[PDB]
Design a protein around this ligand. Structure first.
Ligand SMILES: CC(/C=C/C(=O)NO)=C\[C@@H](C)C(=O)c1ccc(N(C)C)cc1
Ligand SMILES: [K+]
Ligand SMILES: [K+]
Ligand SMILES: [Zn+2]
Length: 357
């Protein structure tokens, strides 16, 4: 009936012990909640309780060996925690990380419950730590557990969902989600991300559009890599209109999960793109036409506190049914974006009839 929102103060209870200016910080989520309140959007949402993920739920994606190790991080010193975090690419540790990460996963599962049982139309978790880089047996890129990968498998097991679409519009490639479902045709992963032929983190050849999945999963992994900076709303709108939504309607998902990072929004200190926050109202609107609008967004990256809050608010207005905004930018894509879109289409053409033109 309404739009669910999950936030708990526990999401603020971890931070970089050795860098007080680390970009992945408590203020990210507090600033979002502050703007949701001042814009009058928070009071229009249905408040949904978070919950801690269970061991069995984590096992849906992560190895028992890795779960046990992360759980032990709550008993380590600033030096020990530093010893384990140096074993991973671009992470920090903190005694409260595991606890918050479990509530971060659980917040998404709460919304999947309510959306799949028709208690709510859709929902947004305002969660950290992020998830889309976490992998079966390792932390990565500020992530401990892969929130949306867990949620997808949870939906299939607990709610009899056959097909899940995961849309990842964070400026970084969610390689963790890609890996978990690489061979799986029941979970379609779409990621649009800065790539620049691998010079942009996470620096992986697998982030290119030639990675279409493997085995039975061929055609169910779709990468849209940007190879120039400064992409705009028109480029994302074009990518969604001519690539993602055609495949989405052909796939017929029963649930859509969004890796809703906002480091592609104008103003992010490191993402390098020029996407207006209003664009995400349109992108969210398009995704509501699919899966009877069964749509759950979960926060990933985005490090300009205002830009990220504005992106969340824009997405939230569309979840709540408010009229789409006026787009300040051109509705015409640039050549680099069209070349990227054309190349991905060429890589995916053989598996999707809706792309055959
Ligand atoms: C992981 C990431 C973005 C994730 C994201 O947004 N995924 O969506 C950005 C990396 C490159 C970064 O900026 C960084 C900063 C400090 C650092 N150490 C000093 C450990 C290591 C890495
Ligand atoms: K992405
Ligand atoms: K897949
Ligand atoms: Zn990111």
């Amino acid at each position: 009936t309404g739009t669910g929102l999950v936030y708990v103060d526990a999401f603020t209870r971890f931070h970089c012990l050795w860098d007080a200016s680390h970009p992945e910080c408590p203020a990210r989520v507090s600033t979002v909640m502050e703007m949701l309140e001042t814009e009058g959007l928070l009071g229009r949402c249905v408040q949904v309780e978070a919950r801690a993920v269970t061991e069995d739920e984590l096992l849906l994606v992560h190895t028992k060996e890795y779960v046990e190790l992360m759980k032990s991080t709550q008993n380590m010193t600033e030096e020990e925690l530093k010893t384990l975090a140096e074993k991973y690419d671009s992470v920090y540790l903190h005694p409260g990380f595991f606890s918050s990460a479990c509530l971060s996963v659980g917040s998404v599962l709460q919304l999947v419950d309510k959306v799949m049982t028709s208690q709510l139309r859709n929902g947004f978790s305002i969660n950290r730590p992020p998830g889309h880089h976490a992998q079966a047996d390792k932390m990565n890129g500020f992530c401990m557990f892969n929130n949306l990968a867990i949620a997808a498998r949870y939906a299939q097991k607990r709610h009899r969902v056959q097909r899940v679409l995961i849309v990842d519009w964070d400026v970084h490639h969610g390689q963790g989600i890609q890996y978990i479902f690489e061979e799986d045709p029941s979970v379609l992963y779409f990621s649009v991300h800065r790539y620049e032929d691998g010079s942009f983190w996470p620096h992986l050849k697998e982030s290119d559009s030639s990675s279409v999945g493997s085995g039975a999963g061929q055609g169910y992994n779709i990468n849209l890599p940007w190879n120039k900076v400064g992409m705009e709303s028109g480029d994302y709108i074009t990518a969604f209109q001519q690539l993602l939504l055609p495949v989405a309607y052909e796939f017929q998902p029963q649930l859509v999960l969004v890796a809703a990072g906002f480091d592609a929004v104008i103003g992010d200190p490191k993402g390098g793109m020029q996407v207006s926050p209003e664009c995400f109202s349109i992108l969210t609107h398009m995704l509501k036409g699919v899966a009877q609008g069964r749509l759950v967004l979960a926060l990933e990256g985005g490090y300009n506190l205002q830009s990220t809050a504005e992106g969340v608010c824009a997405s939230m207005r569309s979840l709540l049914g408010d009229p789409c905004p006026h787009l300040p930018s051109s509705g015409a894509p640039c050549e680099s974006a069209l070349k990227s879109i054309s190349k991905t289409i060429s890589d995916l053409y053989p598996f999707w009839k809706s792309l055959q033109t």
